Amino acid sequence: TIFPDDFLWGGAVAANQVEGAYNEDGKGLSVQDVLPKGGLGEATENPTEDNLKLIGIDFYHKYKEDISLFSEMGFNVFRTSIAWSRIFPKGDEEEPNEAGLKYYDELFDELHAHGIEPLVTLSHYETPLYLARKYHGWVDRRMIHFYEKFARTVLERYKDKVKYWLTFNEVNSVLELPFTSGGIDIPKENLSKQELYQAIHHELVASSLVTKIAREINSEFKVGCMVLAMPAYPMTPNPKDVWATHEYENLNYLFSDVHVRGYYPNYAKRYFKENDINIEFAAEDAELLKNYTVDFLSFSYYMSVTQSALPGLVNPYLESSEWGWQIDPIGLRIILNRYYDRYQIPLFIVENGLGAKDQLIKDELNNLTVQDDYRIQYMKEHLLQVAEALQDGVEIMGYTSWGCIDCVSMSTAQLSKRYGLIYVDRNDDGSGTLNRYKKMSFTWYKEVIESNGESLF
């Protein structure tokens, strides 16, 4: 078979996008609880009722039924985040919140009960609001300690229940979304490249430090980074556009180069110099970065981009989704190869999927469902490209479909753009029964997993 026998098939969410129960069992407020309009929207002074993340999909209470569905599809892996504000409500507590730790104990146990391995993102846009408001988030080096305290607590607690960990979901998303991403509550107009890059530096050092701690705790742990995969193509063979495209890709490669190689790459100096960025290193930083680099690289992949040296563009060769995003399955094979060529370490595709406004409708069998042939087609083409990449010799640990049960979106905090194999009946206004339904893609994907990919051909 093309797919390895140990290949991990699954789905992925973030805690804040599903759990709800934002006020329960001593959970402190996160940044997401003041973001009713999502990452692109403004923050409220206090949580408001129209914020869908308060309730989410109520995964916090519904996880056993949900996990039953995951199990019927045959997942051997499930990616989620541990919500930081559940373990350390303010973030500065001397002791963890035991009800939080107990909750995740139960979650993981339930997963293992069905033969499903947890894959845990330590920080996924969940920063305790107190830390954000008090320290302005990651612009403050004190965040490292807080994060360390968080990580250790959970690494130790779950050390026999969780093999796979991710430190940060895209450290560099701090650049576009300082608040959601870095818990930085200073207005974007007031943030220099210097402050943003310094904040990302603190994240990278924390990632390394936590990698060290992890390895001391359990030598069986696998610790990955998580970055945005976006292969870039030149609009034309004009060498000026080829070079523009290279330079564009370096923006992203900088952070993965730190994660994997353990030092700021050769081209950083120039860029920093041209952008007035000078990273302030604490004396321990270089050695932490160099000595503790990631075991694997995980990434989100949605689309490619086309670049030009002209004072990117719309690729005329790509189809677009009903929602208006272009679609590029070959770009997945391309970026898998680019990353592998560059780093020679295992890769994990941890976010991929097709968003659409699915409509729940009774099929001719009387079952309420979503006829999403579009999602089946997207997943199929992408996974065939994954198969090509496996044959190219790229090491790929697995694939977790993004928002495998419909979740609240990160960017807008809406439910109507749906990624899931499982439809959840709850709407943008908060209404609905919260019942779950299998989409047609549920059955197809079940088939792919149970055949370990052979059904793709």
Added chain:
Amino acid sequence: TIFPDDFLWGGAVAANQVEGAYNEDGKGLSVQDVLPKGGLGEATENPTEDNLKLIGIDFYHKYKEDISLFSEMGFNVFRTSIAWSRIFPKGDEEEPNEAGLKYYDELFDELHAHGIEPLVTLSHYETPLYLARKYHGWVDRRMIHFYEKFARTVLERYKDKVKYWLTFNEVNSVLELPFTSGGIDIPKENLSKQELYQAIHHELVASSLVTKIAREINSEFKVGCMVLAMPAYPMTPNPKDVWATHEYENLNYLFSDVHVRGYYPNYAKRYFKENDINIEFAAEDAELLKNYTVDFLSFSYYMSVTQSALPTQYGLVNPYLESSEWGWQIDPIGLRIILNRYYDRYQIPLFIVENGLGAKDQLIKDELNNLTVQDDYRIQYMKEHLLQVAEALQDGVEIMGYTSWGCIDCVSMSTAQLSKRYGLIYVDRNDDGSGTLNRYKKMSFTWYKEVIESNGESLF
């Protein structure tokens, strides 16, 4: 100052393309002595008078004068090959030929007397003809032994005269030029991909072996590979074209990957299976390759190439590039692109060991009465490419130096002709062998002198 203080500035030739003196001082025949039409041409059973390489430019005798010219330009480096057949005429002798070793001792000595570091290519398309005939060259594993015998011999002899060594000029040349590059005697139509890749495997193993030996002899030696650099661009943003371009570049990356990384790369498995290639490893091969990898990567660069998943809708002309009189497209930015691609992949120092512009230079008298060449085309080419090298240095790429190809006009490899000239120094000899063989400073001589002496500062 943007160029490092220690930057190496110079010129490059191969022995067979300049030296002449093909039968002198105990020299044995090389494969080049039976290639009067060059690597693209047929081999002759015995050397023929129409072969320009018999006399070359007679660098063998005139090297002191030529080197005084190199020194007037301010070269701190000069790249050539040691002709294998001057050391081991047949290749299988128990003892080396002392007249040849003495010759290179004297050559390197003049170089150092003028403050020029030698850069020595161990094998540059010069395999002793005896070995090519007897063993059919690199298809036979015994070549490893002979090559090793040869390299140790020179590595030891020159251990205090030569710091920088290259093992092979393009191992993968074998694919296109089995006889010229691999000493492989067998008719081109009778050679499978399997045989060629096996020959190349032998070369790679031999390169690692010699790397081990070099390190035992002198820990200050720096050993490097030499590959063809050819950055590829997709004709359109169609991801099919982008993938076709990626695939194309892997053909080349395979060999540099073994040299630098020390193992056959991940995509090789698929490519080999599709092409009926199965490499036969000796028991110690994999560990040798893994443990002894090059200190640096050196390359030739002339041009980029554009690729399409479907070429017949139009190995394609790049609309945006200028072309030389001779008819090659010109792509300076491509040099920055490829320096960065290599450094991104391997993170080791790079060395540009072949670059230049070929043209039919006309020797004509200027207004000062001096016979010269008005080669401003060549000045423009070098200026633009060296400005791209400067960009790459600012990009943080580690670059050891630059050696202009055929710095003194030399016999070409592909055609064995003199009329297409790369040099800063014109040599009067023509395709039919005629002429005085006198040397003349081209206009580019003075300009390049100023570049070197300012350490690149004159480029700005």
